[PDB]
Amino acid sequence: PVARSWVCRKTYVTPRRPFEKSRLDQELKLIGEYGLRNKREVWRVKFTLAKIRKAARELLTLDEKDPRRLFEGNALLRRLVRIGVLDEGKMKLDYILGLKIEDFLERRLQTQVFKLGLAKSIHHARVLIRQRHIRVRKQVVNIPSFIVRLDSQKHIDFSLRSPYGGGRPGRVKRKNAKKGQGGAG
Amino acid sequence: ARGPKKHLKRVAAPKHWMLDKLTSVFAPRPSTGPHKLRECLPLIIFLRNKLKYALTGDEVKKICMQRFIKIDGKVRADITYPAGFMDVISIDKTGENFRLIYDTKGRFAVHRITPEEAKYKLCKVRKIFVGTKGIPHLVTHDARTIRYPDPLIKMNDTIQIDLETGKITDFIKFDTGNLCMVTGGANLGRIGVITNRERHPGSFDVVHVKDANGNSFATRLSNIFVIGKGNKPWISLPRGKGIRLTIAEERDKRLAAKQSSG
Amino acid sequence: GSLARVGKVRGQTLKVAKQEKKKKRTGRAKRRMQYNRRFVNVVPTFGKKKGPNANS
Amino acid sequence: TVTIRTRKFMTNRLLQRKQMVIDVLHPGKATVPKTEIREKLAKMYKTTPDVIFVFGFRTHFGGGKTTGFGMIYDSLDYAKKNEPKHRLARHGLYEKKKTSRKQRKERKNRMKKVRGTAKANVGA
Amino acid sequence: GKCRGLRTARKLRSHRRDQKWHDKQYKKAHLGTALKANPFGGASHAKGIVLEKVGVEAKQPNSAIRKCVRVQLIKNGKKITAFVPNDGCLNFIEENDEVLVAGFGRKGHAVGDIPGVRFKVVKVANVSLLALYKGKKERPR
RNA sequence: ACGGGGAAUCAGGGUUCGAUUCCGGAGAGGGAGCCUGAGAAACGGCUACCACAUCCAAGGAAGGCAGCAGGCGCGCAAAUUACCCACUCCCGACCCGGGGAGGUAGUGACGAAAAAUAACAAUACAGGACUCUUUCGAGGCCCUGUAAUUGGAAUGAGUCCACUUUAAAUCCUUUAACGAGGAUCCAUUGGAGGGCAAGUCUGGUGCCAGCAGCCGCGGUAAUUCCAGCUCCAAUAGCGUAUAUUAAAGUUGCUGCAGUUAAAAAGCUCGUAGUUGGAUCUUGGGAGCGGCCGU
């Protein structure tokens, strides 16, 4: 006996066919479009949807005005509407099924850095997060898979311990100050 | 085991203590006493998990050993004393008194009471015994043995004991229309009038209890604790008044306490 | 059996020294260039699509 | 440029303390030491630094904020009577024994061999 | 099924149970005659002592000598032909060596050319036969 | 074959696993018998016999790791003779003592989550929108791609003052000062005939050596070997062996077959088993939202 959890799950499912020419086609485009690193980065969003989507499939088959279906209905909508995917006026648990993987990758903070103009490319936007240059409500986010919320969308700006914001210069420019006056006298 | 159990595992510990998962292997096993292992709450949990006067296990020891804690009027220095239902915990130095009534969900409601209300409590009688010289006896839910009771007190009733003397003052006889705290099963912590006493020879009598909102349910006769005559209680109820709003209704009144609060 | 010429060809194949190779990009950078090679570079060419290792 | 904002305040009149969760704002510098903490609490809640036990900090990711627990006592006698002997020992006013449990365990079992007063005439 | 009646659970179950033995993959697994005959005794891998080096003739369509090793297991004392994989790997295997021996792939059926050679050599004296091939280790003598 | 809670796979059914931290049971080398006690047929209690083995001055004495460490053996197969009662709790005559229970480190690619290995410029230069020009070409408002061409921005891995952490530390976090151009601080592992994403490329071998799960390849132009280059796939992982699940509507309850592919007893009787015809309460009343629903 030990005071431990052991509770863990896989967040991705591997594709049944390892070399579908038409699957490699799409999944490699979704990497280049939203600046991902591997297929695992794609597959886990495919699985988070297929979870969300599977819950909605089950509620649609329940009786109309079931207390579970009504309560669990609004939560699954509010969960999607908060993260800014499904519309605030089209919050109906049928429209959850009519929903795709690009609707989530748009709410990935890597893309939301790039689509706010404080990066130049999506592959640069990942550098600006992984090298802790940004923050969400004065909280430095190091991780580009930070699925941004709707009210928490307009608080994404640079860090205050970074030169790209209102902060001190890094290492390369601070070795130029050693050589700038070092060679002069 | 080949003898009695002295350890309780944190996982096998009952849910309504709401002890977390990750702090330790063991839970505080209640010492034997007036209340059942599951249906009680140890002093240690009331003194650092519910009220947070202590932080660690030694801190709970270094509070109760000064005799500051006074469970129903008679001081216990036992950190694993089973402080169960209706028990009147009296912290005299901070000047706070607590009756242990159930919340409408599993847990015990941390309910503050007036020091006048901390003088008496309510006890459900469990059986009538006749003693060794025709002396009649009561036994209560909290093991209190009272003798020479009122002859109109039967063995599903409740009695109003006094902490100073340990003697009955008034009682609520089990009739229809009288209030009822449900002290067990899925309906743990409901309040409402008794509308049908349904008799089953051999098996257990089910009793239908109607809530203030007409939210009618049923419970076995074992899990009934009559707290008043008609729609008027003899005690101080916890906030919400044991009415049990549903998860659809609990969400609307949680969010309006964030919306209108900000 | 004739266990004499065991490991004949691997033994006698004329060894070519492995060429000096500029170190490859790894992670997203390998995967980024792989996106640019397939979906932005080439025009829709007349005939059937030539493979990644198309040599003739 | 350190600012201490205490939070989740509580009074144990049954342990003789004012216990709270200290939430420190120290933007653009290292985790502030316990010595700098207590001296700000000393001229915030109006107490001598003798009776303040600050401990168990957790620095937020980002690096301008720490939230730990602190407890401020009525007296130094009360500070020692109802306290873990490790949190006392940080200020040097509890000096624990120096020999390990492995030393004591063999010494317990070596004493257990001998019957009578002449237990102590065997080990050391 | 055939008998559909609402009170026909014991026949449908007992029929399915009786007729399951006529399956090959079942009766092989659920009578222990396969496991008693399996030289590994249900183990994935097994260690054994090399005692000679056999040059196995391949099947008629493919005429070539498959250089295998007769291995005797540490646990059973049962004798086994184990296919030494690769071009020249047999050269790294000498008589009286604790070689780790695995199956070939088809779960106890002879694979491709090699007749009745169900096993292959994986390691030689706690050193992988892949590492000896690549030249990332040498045979400790 | 300890049972169960559960676990894996999973359309709907299922199939398989569950020694394993929670619950219950059992046992302490094999049996057996007892003492004390509220509670034991107790084994960190005892007494016997058996197996095993210990010290012996040879008379005797002593033992029980399926506790935590560790060793040997067995093997395809599994960690330190570390620190500590501070936490969780338990026991005691007890606020004080004790706890290899437990906790904390070590070992750990069993596994699960996050997630580096660059980024953005400049120019060569190669495309595409586009005014133009038949084309060739230039403008370039939009940028689009990649070079041992150059450029200045970056932050991390690591060395590591000090705090924080904690029983004491470690690690994380925090922070100084350092710390990246072939940013040599260099990502593997399997493959490239088909199934199955990827070379009719060179050089060697000549049914040899080897490959190859399967089909096949190798007989001197080898898309299959052995290598070089290029390329593909997954990626801090990837291959292999074996058990198992889906695939398997190839166990068929859902849902398979039985003329000829495997398969209807030679035939009839017959008891369990399974399965069994139709038939017995409907017609109105009386209010309800706009002949109609309640």
Swiss-Prot record, chain A:
GO terms for biological process: ribosomal small subunit biogenesis; translation. There is a cross-link at residues 92, 138 (Glycyl lysine isopeptide (Lys-Gly) (interchain with G-Cter in SUMO2)). It is found in: Cytoplasm; Nucleus, Nucleolus. InterPro entries: Ribosomal_uS4, Ribosomal_uS4_CS, Ribosomal_uS4_euk/arc, Ribosomal_uS4_N, S4_RNA-bd, S4_RNA-bd_sf. Residues 107-181 form the S4 RNA-binding domain. One of its GO terms (molecular function) is rRNA binding. Keywords: Acetylation, Cytoplasm, Isopeptide bond, Nucleus, Phosphoprotein, Ribonucleoprotein, Ribosomal protein, RNA-binding, rRNA-binding, Ubl conjugation. Its main location: cytoplasm. The modification N6-acetyllysine is found at residues 65, 115, 154. Pfam families: Ribosomal_S4 (PF00163), S4 (PF01479). The keyword Cytoplasm applies. GO terms for cellular component: cytosolic ribosome; cytosolic small ribosomal subunit; nucleolus. Residues 161-185 are annotated as: Disordered. It comes from the Eukaryota. The modification Phosphoserine is found at residues 152, 162. PANTHER family: 30S 40S RIBOSOMAL PROTEIN, SMALL RIBOSOMAL SUBUNIT PROTEIN US4. Component of the small ribosomal subunit. The ribosome is a large ribonucleoprotein complex responsible for the synthesis of proteins in the cell. Part of the small subunit (SSU) processome, first precursor of the small eukaryotic ribosomal subunit. During the assembly of the SSU processome in the nucleolus, many ribosome biogenesis factors, an RNA chaperone and ribosomal proteins associate with the nascent pre-rRNA and work in concert to generate RNA folding, modifications, rearrangements and cleavage as well as targeted degradation of pre-ribosomal RNA by the RNA exosome. Belongs to the universal ribosomal protein uS4 family. This is Small ribosomal subunit protein uS4. The gene is RPS9.
Curated annotation (Swiss-Prot), chain B:
Component of the small ribosomal subunit. The ribosome is a large ribonucleoprotein complex responsible for the synthesis of proteins in the cell. Part of the small subunit (SSU) processome, first precursor of the small eukaryotic ribosomal subunit. During the assembly of the SSU processome in the nucleolus, many ribosome biogenesis factors, an RNA chaperone and ribosomal proteins associate with the nascent pre-rRNA and work in concert to generate RNA folding, modifications, rearrangements and cleavage as well as targeted degradation of pre-ribosomal RNA by the RNA exosome. GO terms for cellular component: cytosolic ribosome; cytosolic small ribosomal subunit; nucleolus. GO terms for molecular function: rRNA binding; structural constituent of ribosome. It is found in: Cytoplasm; Nucleus, Nucleolus. Pfam families: 40S_S4_C, KOW, Ribosomal_S4e, RS4NT. Component of the small ribosomal subunit. Part of the small subunit (SSU) processome, composed of more than 70 proteins and the RNA chaperone small nucleolar RNA (snoRNA) U3. Identified in a IGF2BP1-dependent mRNP granule complex containing untranslated mRNAs. The gene is RPS4X. Belongs to the eukaryotic ribosomal protein eS4 family. HAMAP family: Ribosomal_eS4 (MF_00485). This is Small ribosomal subunit protein eS4. Gene3D superfamilies: 2.30.30.30, 2.40.50.740, RNA-binding S4 domain (3.10.290.10). GO terms for biological process: translation. The modification N6-acetyllysine is found at residue 232. Residues 41-103 form the S4 RNA-binding domain.
Swiss-Prot record, chain C:
The modification N6-succinyllysine is found at residue 48. It is found in: Cytoplasm; Nucleus. Component of the 40S subunit of the ribosome. Contributes to the assembly and function of 40S ribosomal subunits. Component of the 40S subunit of the ribosome. This is Small ribosomal subunit protein eS30. The lineage of its organism: Eukaryota, Metazoa, Chordata, Craniata, Vertebrata. The gene is FAU. The chain holds residues 78 to 133 of 133 of the full protein.
Curated annotation (Swiss-Prot), chain E:
Keywords: Acetylation, Cytoplasm, Endoplasmic reticulum, Hydroxylation, Isopeptide bond, Nucleus, Ribonucleoprotein, Ribosomal protein, Ubl conjugation. The gene is RPS23. GO terms for biological process: translation. Hydroxylation at Pro-61 affects translation termination efficiency. PANTHER family: 30S RIBOSOMAL PROTEIN S12 FAMILY MEMBER. Component of the 40S small ribosomal subunit. Part of the small subunit (SSU) processome, composed of more than 70 proteins and the RNA chaperone small nucleolar RNA (snoRNA) U3. Residues 1-25 are annotated as: Disordered. GO terms for molecular function: structural constituent of ribosome. NCBIfam families: PRK04211.1, uS12_E_A. Component of the ribosome, a large ribonucleoprotein complex responsible for the synthesis of proteins in the cell. The small ribosomal subunit (SSU) binds messenger RNAs (mRNAs) and translates the encoded message by selecting cognate aminoacyl-transfer RNA (tRNA) molecules. The large subunit (LSU) contains the ribosomal catalytic site termed the peptidyl transferase center (PTC), which catalyzes the formation of peptide bonds, thereby polymerizing the amino acids delivered by tRNAs into a polypeptide chain. It comes from Oryctolagus cuniculus. The modification 3-hydroxyproline is found at residue 61. The modification N6-acetyllysine is found at residue 134. The modification N6-succinyllysine is found at residue 53. Its main location: cytoplasm. This is Small ribosomal subunit protein uS12. It comes from the Eukaryota. Transmembrane segments: none annotated. The keyword Nucleotide-binding does not apply. It is found in: Cytoplasm, Cytosol; Cytoplasm; Rough endoplasmic reticulum; Nucleus, Nucleolus. Residues 1-19 have a biased composition (Basic residues). PROSITE patterns: RIBOSOMAL_S12. One of its GO terms (cellular component) is cytosolic ribosome. There is a cross-link at residue 36 (Glycyl lysine isopeptide (Lys-Gly) (interchain with G-Cter in SUMO2)). Coiled coil: none annotated.
